[PDB]
Amino acid sequence: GPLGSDYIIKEKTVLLQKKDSEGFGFVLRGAEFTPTPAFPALQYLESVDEGGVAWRAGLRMGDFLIEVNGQNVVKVGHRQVVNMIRQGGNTLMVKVVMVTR
Ligand SMILES: CC(C)C[C@H](N)C(=O)O
């Protein structure tokens, strides 16, 4: 609008269940930190393997990572988030948000 940017925010929570001999099929990248509607989290999905576990569940390149296995990771550093994802083994529940600007 004339007073500022408008967005659509689409929240997606998915359960990823993978096999031992595969990844979840995404690459995390990291963008004090205060979240904003346009910029909701430090970590986001730089890429998602088409047809991989994450892709099939509905995750997409550009999604911002909000939660991992019930823990909010909006303000959490890259290495820490990766370690939290690995703690779950072959199971990962994540919440992401897709921002259209
Ligand atoms: C967050 C990362 C550890 C995910 C990893 N690249 C995978 O595809 O399983």
Numbering used by the authors: 651 to 681, 689 to 758
From the paper:
As a model β-strand mediated PPI, we use the GKAP/SHANK-PDZ50 which, plays a role in the organization of synaptic protein complexes and has been linked to several neuronal disorders. There are >250 PDZ domains with several therapeutically relevant proteins known to exhibit their function through a PDZ mediated interaction. Class I PDZ domains bind to consensus sequences with a Thr/Ser in the -2 position from the C-terminus, with the C-terminus hydrophobic residue and free carboxylate being the main determinants of affinity. Here, we used dynamic ligation screening to identify peptide-fragment hybrids linked through an acylhydrazone bond, that are able to functionally mimic a β-strand and inhibit its PPI using GKAP/SHANK1 PDZ as a model interaction.
